[PDB]
Each structure stands twice: as C-alpha cells, then as structure tokens.
C-alpha cells in the first residue's frame, strides 16, 4: 500500500464533497477538508477495509495570522495494517467550534486539550476540555503568533504575604531579536 494507491483509491471511493484539496508528495499524502466533514472523513478512514487507519499519531494547530481562518488543525494518522501514514488538515478561526474525534480515537483527548490550551480552538462534544499545560488561571494562548515570547506575568515569592504571587513581567535583559534576513 504505497502513497500512489492511497491517492488514487481515495479519489475513487470517498464522497466528493468531503475533500477540497489533495496533495500527493514525498513529504506526505495530505487531505484538506471542511470542518463539518472532518469527523465523518476520519470515521470512514478508520473503518474502511482498504484504509484501516487505526492510530491517531497526534493533532496539532498552526497559526497563520494573514488568513481569514487563521488556525490550521492537522491530524497525523497511521495504518499499521498497511504500513502507511495520512495527513488530514482543516482550518478554523478564533470562535468556530470544530468537532472532537475522541469517540473515534480516545488518544485525541489530551491532544485536543493541548490545542485549546495553546491556540484557543474549541472542540464540540469533548468530554473534558480544559487547559492541560499552562499554569492555572493562565490568560492567553501562548502558541498564537501575537502572544509574546516571555508572556505577560511572572511569579516570585512575596514574604509579606508568605506566598508565591504573580506580577507583570520585568526583564533584566530583554530577548534580543537578531534579524539575519
């Protein structure tokens, strides 16, 4: 089962309205789909006899500030049955909720929490969507390109209050940007 067979067989068998873009390349076979079809496309690929995509390797977001739908959500999937990989991507914005695939691949649960934490994209029907990496009470989504590298707040011990507290950042030496272009 080579990438030549997957590209051709997916063109013949998939419903046409699901896939808007198909890229066959040595970097990877990629299927771009609308958000309303992502869940169904991933269920087809998992259950169909000639694809048997049973493992969701991971889900990640990419931020494209110059785009109307700035977020790209990428699903890297694997078929151990046919020894092949597939990439399924869809686009999203700051307020549009997309479908969760936890009911298809239980491993998606923590990855979708990471996407919500890092980018602010929300997932319909996710059993427990809350931040997973950042500190409690964190504000913002650090992987957005407009989020500053050093953030907005920092912590320190405050003896009068006998506790660790958060205050606006003060940098002894700033990050030096070296524009080498």
């Amino acid at each position: 089962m080579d990438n030549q067979f997957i590209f051709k067989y997916s063109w013949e068998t998939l419903p046409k309205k699901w896939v808007k873009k198909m890229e066959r390349s040595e970097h990877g076979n990629r299927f771009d789909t609308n958000t309303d079809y992502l869940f169904q496309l991933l269920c087809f690929l998992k259950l169909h006899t000639y694809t048997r995509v049973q493992v969701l390797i991971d889900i990640c977001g990419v931020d494209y500030p110059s785009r109307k739908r700035r977020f790209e959500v990428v699903y890297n999937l694997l078929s151990t049955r046919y020894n092949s990989r597939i990439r399924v991507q869809t686009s999203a914005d700051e307020v549009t909720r997309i479908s969760s695939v936890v009911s298809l691949f239980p491993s998606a649960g923590w990855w979708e929490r990471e996407v919500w934490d890092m980018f602010g994209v929300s997932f319909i029907n996710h059993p427990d969507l809350r931040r997973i990496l950042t500190d409690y009470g964190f504000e913002g989504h650090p992987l957005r390109k407009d989020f500053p590298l050093s953030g907005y707040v920092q912590v320190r011990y405050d003896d009068p209050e006998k506790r660790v507290v958060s205050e606006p950042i003060e940098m002894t030496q700033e990050f030096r940007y070296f524009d080498f272009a």
Binding site: V95, N125, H126, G137
Partner: protein, 112 residues
C-alpha cells in the same frame, strides 16, 4: 458535560448566559470561605462584579462570541474554586475589597 455546539440564536445564547451567571453566583459562598473574605467584601459585591462583567458585553451580537465568553468564564470560575491563587485584595482578575488626569500622567512619566 461535553462542549455543546455553537448557539443557534441569541435566545439559546442568553439561556446559556443566564445559566452561567447562576452557576457563578451559586459558588460565591465557596469563594468567600476559600479566600477568607468575611471581613473584606460583601457577597453582593461579588455578585455585582459578575453582573457588571456580563453587562459590559451587552453589545455583542454574534452568538459564537457569546459562547466563547461563557466558556472562558466557566474556565476562570473553575480555577478560582479548585486551584485558588490567593492574593490579598485580588481574586483571579477582580480587585476585591483638583487636576485632570493629564497632569497626573504628565507628573508620572512621558508614556501615557
């Protein structure tokens, strides 16, 4: 339990806004106990800050934005009750408990 779909209309969104406000207000006694606010602020002042927050966003017309605001409010409330980060006159992001502004800003610094 799961994240519900995006609200169809402002009636669905408002039902959700009312539901959140009710949950936020019903947790007020728990917060007062966690942060020991019995001698700092009144429970109604906590209620006013929550209703204020909601009233500042009364000009939003897009149900998707309202859903995101409710989700972020629910997340903020859960942290305050479960993982309290105690600061004296501050709960989360809420301060609890003859010259114009220009001349004050001028006296302070050159950056307004």
């Amino acid at each position: 339990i799961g994240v519900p779909p995006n609200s169809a209309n402002l009636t669905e969104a408002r039902r959700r806004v009312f539901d959140f406000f009710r949950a936020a207000c019903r947790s007020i006694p728990t917060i007062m106990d966690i942060y020991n606010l019995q001698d700092v602020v009144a429970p109604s002042q906590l209620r006013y800050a929550i209703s204020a927050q909601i009233r500042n966003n009364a000009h939003i017309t897009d149900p998707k934005v309202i859903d995101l605001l409710i989700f972020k409010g629910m997340e903020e409330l859960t942290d305050i009750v479960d993982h309290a980060k105690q600061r004296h006159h501050i709960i989360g992001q809420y301060v609890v408990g003859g010259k114009t502004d220009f001349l004050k800003n001028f006296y302070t610094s050159n950056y307004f």
